[PDB]
Model the fold of this input.
Amino acid sequence: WRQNTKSSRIEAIKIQILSKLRLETAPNISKDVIRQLLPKAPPLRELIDQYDYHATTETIITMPFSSKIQYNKVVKAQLWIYLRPVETPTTVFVQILRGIRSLKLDMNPGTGIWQSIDVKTVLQNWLKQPESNLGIEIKALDENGHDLAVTFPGPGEDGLNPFLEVKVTDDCDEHSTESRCCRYPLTVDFEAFGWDWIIAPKRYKANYCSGECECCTPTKMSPINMLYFNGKEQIIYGKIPAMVVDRCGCS
Amino acid sequence: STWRQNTKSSRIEAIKIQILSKLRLETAPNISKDVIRQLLPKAPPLRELIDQYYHATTETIITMPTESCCFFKFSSKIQYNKVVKAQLWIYLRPVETPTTVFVQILRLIKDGTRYTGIRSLKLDMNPGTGIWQSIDVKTVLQNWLKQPESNLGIEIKALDEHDLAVTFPGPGEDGLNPFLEVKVTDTPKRSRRCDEHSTESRCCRYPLTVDFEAFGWDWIIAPKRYKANYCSGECEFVFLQKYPHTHLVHQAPCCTPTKMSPINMLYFNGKEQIIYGKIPAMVVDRCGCS
Done:
C-alpha cells in the first residue's frame, strides 16, 4: 500500500510548504534564469554550504548532588536552615560549614527563624572539579550553648529538614516490516519535481507514521531551515516549523 | 453508557506513560502519604512554588535591483525596528595592472543635486582575481522603511587610475549582480484562535480531568488535579491545493489535537530529590482532522 500512498504523501507536504511560506503559487523561473539571478558571493555560500523539547528543569531542591549538572548552568543557589523556637530571648551564632559561612542574630521567644545562606560559589566549585564534597555541617549555638539548628530531623519535626535549592537554566519500519505503528522513512527531492528554485535544501528526509495503534499521528516534529526565491526577485532565507517527523504516537 | 465509558480508563493510561517518558523516568516513584509528610519540607521557598496557581519564520532577506541603475525596492511588510544588520554588496572586476580603487556609494535625493553620500571607500587591488566589498546600509535602510516616498535608488562607482563596479550585469557575469543582504527578526504575530455531554457527532473536545491523588500518584504535590480533555470522532481531509481544483484525502484521515498547552508540575526524583518543571503539550485545546 506504501507504493501508491507515497505519491500522495509528498503532495500533502508540497501544499503544506506553499501555505506555511505564505505563497499563493510557486515562482516560475528557469535553471538558466536562476544561474544569473543567484549571486555567487561569500555571504550566500556560507549559508549554502552550512549542510554539506520534551522536558524542562527549572529549580532543583536537594535533600541531605545529581550526576547531570554543569558549573556554568546554575543561576542561584541557597542552603536553608530552620532554627527551633526558643523559650528565653537569646542570641544565636549560626555557622554553615562543609571555608564556611558565619552569621550572628538575636532571637525572640516563639519564633521559628528559617534563615538561608548563599552557596552559589561552593555548589559551582564542587561540580567544576572535586565532585566529592557533599558534607552536611551547620551550627546555631544559643546563649547557654544549645544548638537550635535542625541538623538531624527530630520526632516532632514534620517538614523542617535543611535543603539546598538551586535555580538552573535547561524511523523503525524501513519499508520492510509489520508492527503497531512505525515511522516509515520518506525523503523529499524538490529538484526531482517541477521547480528548481529551492536553493537549499534540494533533498531532505521527512518520514511519516503508518499503523493501526491500540489513531497514529507524529509526536516529535523538528523544523528545517530553507533558502528560496520570491516575487520581484527576493532570495529569502527562513526556517519552516514542523517538517521532519522524529517520533510516532497513538492519539 | 457509550464508547466514552470504556475509553476513559484507557485514555488516562495513555498520559500516565507519556508523563513518565517526558520526565525521563524509568518507573514512577513509590512514596506513601506518611513518607511524603516527612520528606516534603514546610518552608517559605516551597509554599511559594506550591501556591503558584506557527508560520514559516523569515531570517535573512536578499533583495535584487530593478528599474523605475541599481534601484532597490524593499517590502512594506518589514518594519524599521525589525531589522538587525543590513549590508549592500558590490563585486569589482579583476584588474590587469595593480591599481587602487575609489569606490563611492550615494543615495539620490531631490542647490538641488541628485546625490547624497552613503559610504566612500579607498582600497588597493592586486591583478589576481575579482573581489567583493560589503558596505553597511543599516541606518539608510531604516530611514527608507520609515519614509518610503524618499526611498529613491542608489549609484555605485569604482574608478581605478575605468569603473570596475558591476552596475549593469555583463554577459559573462553569471552571479555577480549587486544585492542587499538584510538580517531581520521575525515577530511571532499569533492571531486570535465544543461538545459538553451528549450528541458526540463528528469530533469535538470531550472534557477529561486527571486526578493523581485518586489513581495512587500521591508522590506529586502540584497539581493534584488537572484538566486535559481529548478528541473523539471521525472525518475526511480536504487540502485546497491550487484552488478552485481542491484535493481530498480518504483512508481505505483521523481526529488528533491541534493546539496543545503545557503545564507546570512539582514532583519527586528517584534520588529522593524534589524537582520543579514544566511538562510540554499536556492540555488539549483544539481538535483537528489529520
User: Anything to note?
Assistant: Chain B touches chain A through 65 residues (CB under 8 Å). Chain B has two domains: 3-53+197-289, 60-184. The first helix of chain B runs from residue 3 to 22. The helical segments of chain B are 3-22, 33-39, 44-50, 138-146.
